[PDB]
Amino acid sequence: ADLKAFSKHIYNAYLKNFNMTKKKARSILTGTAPFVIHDIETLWQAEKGLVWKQLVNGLPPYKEISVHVFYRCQCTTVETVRELTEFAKSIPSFSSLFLNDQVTLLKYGVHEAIFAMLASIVNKDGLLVANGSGFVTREFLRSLRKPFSDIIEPKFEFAVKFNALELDDSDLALFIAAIILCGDRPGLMNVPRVEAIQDTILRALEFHLQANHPDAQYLFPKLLQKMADLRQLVTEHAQMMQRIKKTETETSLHPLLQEIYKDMY
Numbered sequence: 001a002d003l004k005a006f007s008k009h010i011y012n013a014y015l016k017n018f019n020m021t022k023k024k025a026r027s028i029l030t031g032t033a034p035f036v037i038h039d040i041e042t043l044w045q046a047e048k049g050l051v052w053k054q055l056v057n058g059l060p061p062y063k064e065i066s067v068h069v070f071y072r073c074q075c076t077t078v079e080t081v082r083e084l085t086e087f088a089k090s091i092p093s094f095s096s097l098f099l100n101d102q103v104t105l106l107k108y109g110v111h112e113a114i115f116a117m118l119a120s121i122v123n124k125d126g127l128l129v130a131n132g133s134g135f136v137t138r139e140f141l142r143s144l145r146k147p148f149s150d151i152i153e154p155k156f157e158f159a160v161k162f163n164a165l166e167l168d169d170s171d172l173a174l175f176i177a178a179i180i181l182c183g184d185r186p187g188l189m190n191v192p193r194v195e196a197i198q199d200t201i202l203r204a205l206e207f208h209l210q211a212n213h214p215d216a217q218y219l220f221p222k223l224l225q226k227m228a229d230l231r232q233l234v235t236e237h238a239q240m241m242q243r244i245k246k247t248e249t250e251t252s253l254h255p256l257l258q259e260i261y262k263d264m265y
């Protein structure tokens with residue numbers, strides 16, 4: 001396996017399938033400036049004035065700001081699952097797995113990948129929304145009522161720390177691939193094949209980081225630990241979502257996410 005060619009293929013698949021990259025996000029977040037959403041009035045103005053991928057008339061009828069924000073979060077989550085599915089399938093070895101193992105890997109991997117990619121659009125003060133045309137403040141998200149504020153803040157804590165590693169998109173492409181191709185997922189049929197693919201991706205990641213981050217201390221083992229950390233982040237996330245299902249019975253949960261969280265514990 002030619003690791004340079006492998007890494008380049010997975011980088012190109014990443015650029016092909018994720019419109020918002022860390023490079024683009026950073027060029028916005030550091031200077032057409034985003035519209036800042038920090039309260040009800042600015043959220044309303046942003047719904048009227050910004051271009052959103054999911055049109056608002058498709059979301060459930062507005063009841064309160066915290067639930068509307070949750071629905072916008074769900075929208076973006078589902079859209080990123082679509083992109084991650086196409087990204088994964090752009091990897092030949094992955095598409096060679098039977099479709100049931102592909103689904104198992106995505107089921108248990110997409111939220112780990114999502115929360116790693118989130119750092120790309122985050123800084124300590126907020127995150128980009130609406131394809132970079134809006135910026136929602138972290139203090140506004142903290143202001144939402146429980147339990148919605150509580151499901152947001154841990155992701156910021158993880159993301160700010162993750163951004164201290166200063167990965168670029170070419171690194172992230174391999175890191176995300178390694179998260180999806182994980183031999184540890186429950187119910188996987190061809191564990192040895194998945195473990196073998198994962199191992200090739202990890203070898204490509206170390207090779208790539210050597211070339212791309214020649215001065216970095218311990219970056220490869222630091223990223224292996226981040227993979228473990230993301231497992232814990234998603235465990236806690238799923239536990240919170242299952243609680244929302246029990247205590248917020250009026251709040252809609254997208255059926256795809258329902259399927260994803262079925263049988264998690």
Ligand SMILES: CC(C)N(Cc1ccccc1OCCCCCC(=O)O)C(=O)c1ccc(-c2ccccc2)cc1
Nearest residue numbers: 069072073074076077114118129136151152155241257
């Ligand atoms: C996909 C990433 C992760 N998110 C969501 C997100 C970011 C950080 C922390 C938590 C988040 O979502 C937690 C709940 C997810 C439930 C879906 C589920 O997993 O079941 C986003 O990119 C995002 C999208 C839209 C907004 C938004 C907020 C106010 C007004 C307009 C838009 C904010 C964020």
Ligand SMILES: CCCCCCCO[C@@H]1O[C@H](CO)[C@@H](O)[C@H](O)[C@H]1O
Nearest residue numbers: 081085103106107110256259260262
């Ligand atoms: C779009 C990629 C992400 C797919 C995530 C959803 C996977 O859900 C699972 O789908 C299977 C049917 O395939 C069922 O057998 C399982 O009960 C269910 O848990």
Ligand SMILES: [K+]
Nearest residue numbers: 123124160163
């Ligand atoms: K940051």
